[PDB]
Symmetry: C3
Subunit: 428 residues, 3 copies
């Protein structure tokens, strides 16, 4: 299948990304829980007591019950207001981390895809080698029979061939376990997928460095979080400072209050005391609180938040310096990836002409078999190296985009025009 079909059937079925969503959804959900202390609170209370102790002055037994609707409404708290802003501040950061975890999923699917893709290429070339030197191995054990080739050359040929049996083995395994990186970031066994078309290939020169660096130090997801995180630490210098500010609360209630009286000293009593008191209530009130001095606590908390700000500040410096080098580094990687293909292709023909001339030398008996087996292995390496440079450019293209922050569907779309022929993924 096409890349944008492996990823397509993977982005909606990705167990990490969705958890990142459920994290953001909960982070946004409590935007209400942080608001709730700024709304009227209402409860229903009901008590029943049984008093029974006795006098050295008072005494007497009683039975009281009660019920009420209490209400509270904050008027000027600020810290309750502050906790609301912080929860808004903190959900934005959690929304960027999701936008970041969206970013990552692209790469990992692409990377795991090409992991499998050039895993074939290696096993494919090891199969191409293991047989191209089976031609050399066969004819030589017949050229030996004519007596033209020594009793020693064949022995060396057989041993070099066996150490290609081993390479082929740990090239199958490399293809298998690569499929087992894709069956995770995707959750699918793909029996075939689109190989990159060899001649349908054009290496476009990466856009200039300083232009990429400016664009990134604005739309990059990593310093955005670090900036929003300096915002969070900043509003916390304010949160600590609220511990000086006064507070104003409103109460309103409607209660009932019954009483009864038991035993002796209650029966046959004088006046109002045994009297069963059955009354209720309607209250409305205002409470005001202002801290004068407390151990220098709220002081300490401010400096603490200030230092925490210096921190989150330097943490941005780390985040900026990181991006500073992610663009340069991958820009060097996409440049070098150009020169690499333009060098390894040159070495494919150079190793090629050297090979066929050795087979011409193996003919007419002017050259050895151990000499042509050097010619073959140095050819197939040049090819293998050529394959890698192609994939490293593709992967470093995404990186240079992803460092900017601008990695999306469209970047992954323009890469379907490059690939074509569907290749097998089974090491049989």
């Amino acid at each position: 299948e096409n890349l944008m079909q492996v990823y397509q059937q993977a982005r909606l079925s990705n167990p990490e990304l969705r958890k990142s969503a459920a994290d953001r959804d909960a982070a946004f959900e409590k935007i209400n829980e942080a608001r709730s202390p700024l709304l009227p609170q209402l409860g229903l209370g009901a008590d029943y007591t049984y008093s029974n102790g006795y006098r050295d002055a008072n005494g007497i037994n009683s039975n009281a019950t009660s019920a009420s609707l209490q209400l509270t409404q904050s008027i000027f708290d600020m810290s309750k207001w502050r906790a609301l802003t912080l929860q808004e501040k903190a959900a934005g950061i959690q929304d960027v981390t999701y936008q970041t975890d969206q970013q990552t999923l692209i790469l990992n699917t692409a990377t795991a895809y090409f992991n499998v893709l050039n895993a074939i290429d290696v096993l494919s070339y090891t199969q191409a080698q293991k047989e191209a030197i089976y031609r050399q191995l066969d004819q030589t054990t017949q050229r030996f029979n004519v007596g033209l080739v020594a009793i020693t050359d064949v022995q060396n040929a057989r041993a070099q061939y066996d150490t290609v049996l081993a390479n082929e083995l740990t090239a199958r395994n490399n293809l298998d376990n690569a499929v087992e990186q894709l069956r995770q970031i995707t959750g699918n066994y793909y029996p075939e997928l689109a190989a990159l078309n060899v001649e349908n290939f054009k290496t476009d020169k990466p856009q200039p460095v300083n232009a990429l660096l400016k664009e990134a130090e604005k739309r990059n997801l990593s310093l955005l979080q670090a900036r929003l995180s300096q915002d969070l630490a900043r509003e916390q210098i304010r949160q600590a400072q609220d511990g000086h500010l006064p507070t104003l609360d409103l109460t309103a209630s409607t209660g009932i209050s019954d009483t009864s009286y038991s035993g002796s000293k209650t029966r046959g009593a004088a006046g109002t005391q045994y009297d069963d008191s059955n009354m209720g209530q309607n209250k409305v009130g205002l409470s005001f609180s202002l801290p004068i001095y407390q151990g220098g606590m709220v002081n300490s908390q401010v400096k603490q938040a200030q230092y925490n700000f210096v921190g989150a500040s330097e943490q941005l410096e780390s985040a900026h310096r990181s991006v500073v080098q992610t663009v340069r580094s991958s820009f060097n990687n996409i440049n070098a990836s150009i020169s690499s293909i333009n060098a390894y292709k040159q070495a494919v023909v150079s190793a090629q002409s050297s090979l066929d001339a050795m087979e011409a030398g193996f003919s007419v008996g002017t050259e050895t078999i151990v000499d042509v087996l050097d010619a073959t292995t140095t050819l197939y390496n040049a090819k293998q190296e050529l394959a890698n440079a192609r994939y490293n450019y593709l992967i470093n293209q995404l990186n240079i985009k992803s460092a900017l922050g601008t990695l999306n569907e469209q970047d992954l779309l323009a890469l379907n025009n490059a690939l074509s022929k569907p290749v097998s993924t089974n090491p049989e």
Copy 2:
């Protein structure tokens, strides 16, 4: 000492494991703390105080002393029962982590043990390669003495010999460190270890791909945990919801209360209601509390607990996906391992192109030394590959059992039979 003796010494002492033990013993003990708020709560407290006539209170100033036994008891506080369940679940997860860690100690002890043995093989084979090159250098010198060998041949030999001395250096340094590795797991230095006896090396395949996948879905330790934690998230919804329910509480007091007055004792129009009041009471009242509208707070948390559940459900698929691509991965690996032993077992056989052919013809003047050297590396470049591949097998059996979660003390009892020959860790 052998693998079981070395392992069992590690079990006793290993600080990583015993920490992981305390972390579980503490967590289990926390059940008692989490249960405490359900049992009776018995406090006590005295309370002296002194009043003053600041305005109309003039000439009325009190001093009252009071003591009291205070008892509270929960009769249906739902959130408290939930706290106990949550903590039992908390300790359930914590016992499973401790189990994983037991698995980890085993895999580590063996991993580190089969480093020392491999280090010994790279050393052996290097100084075997070293001592062999010295033979062919020796007889080349004395052939050059009698003018049969061009100086380049000797210059070449001595060059290759000098690399091998440099290799014989890094080979000893590795073994030196690999000992120090074994000691920071185990706690002891080992003057000798039982090496792999190659004569009776069994290489029987594994159980089919599916038999493991099944077995590693009932028995596997890291998945069992992702289950237990999705459970914990469920039980946490239940917890959140309990913010709606009413709470009922039994209370009981009994305490003295002695006041006295003195100031403008008595003037007029009142009565001596300022007599030395010596109170005693004996309360046993139970009370009820139910919340109506709490600012939409309790629902946010119900929604959040649900979003957090979806997330805990997400990372259960993630854990499952891990499990597949660890059994499948570890299966492929044990295949390539056995498959590799064969390939490298013949590669060593065919590498006796060095044996005859090269060594033979060199001694009778036929083959050039440079070529005889290239043979006498290829053989040893296969000797190491073989022994290395064998120890890769022995820790791919163990790797599967880790995925199956059945990895235990028994599986070492197997591998201790494979060993036999006591070889020293600090040769020469």
Copy 3:
């Protein structure tokens, strides 16, 4: 600039070390927050309530305001004293974290610097391996047209040359990436860096491994913090069992409160009138509290604390077990590094003499270019390694200082002498 200078530029500008500082500075500042509950706690408050009649209250309303000046002063409370002790010990463990971070920068700088120096050497030599084989190619094709026909083996020399272009390619890149690397840590691009002076280069044996070990055990910073943390655990045991102790308090407050009544009850008396009650009071009081039983909470708290202390002890074992294995590695690593310098040192003079003889031979026609290229390749390999070995040495020399925890500017000044000849960080 030089190693010493690059550090001074990074010391003041590094975002990581400066963030560490902020974390330490906050920690120390917290000792004030922790101390604050032991000091007086002054607070002003004000109320207003309107009560309205219901049943037996029907026809009685009230308007009451009050204003007080409250103060709380803890007399005896071990927990509040324990909180302060703990915060200080917290700040201490933070301080050792900071000291550790100071070191990591030093070690990290050196690594990045000698990586730029190593990428120079790797490139500088690749070009000298490229230029040697270009002469090789030129001063061969001159003879090829005329004399000894090289149709089969001048194409091999051309393929040889093409791979050393793809090699110099990668080399060019590993210099850029290694500089951006140095930048991140230092916040500087460097055109010039002081390189190692081979003439000036000596090697000094390390102090005996036992002297080192003893020295580490007494001032290694990881072990120091490990001991501090185990102390924290112990003190947290005491903190738990402070639950058993009583809490003697003091509260002083001077207040003002007045109630004015309204409704169907304005004929009667409380004293001279049953209406106005403007009054104030001055209060001072002690407040004894003592828990007697509470679900066995405190008992389990101490059991947890104790178990948790076992983990701190086990962690202290892990630390020591580590410092042992680190110190002994750092020792092994340095001795092997000297022993390697010596080996590769001879490996060049050997490789030179081999090539010297090969150049001379081929110069007459007694040797082939295939052999003169192989000989040139192995000379630059040895020169590569030798360069690499000395740079490694210096690192292992700092590593050992880092293991016994004494690494500082002094050590970075030491190496400054061995550097001198300034090299460009990109000639192209």
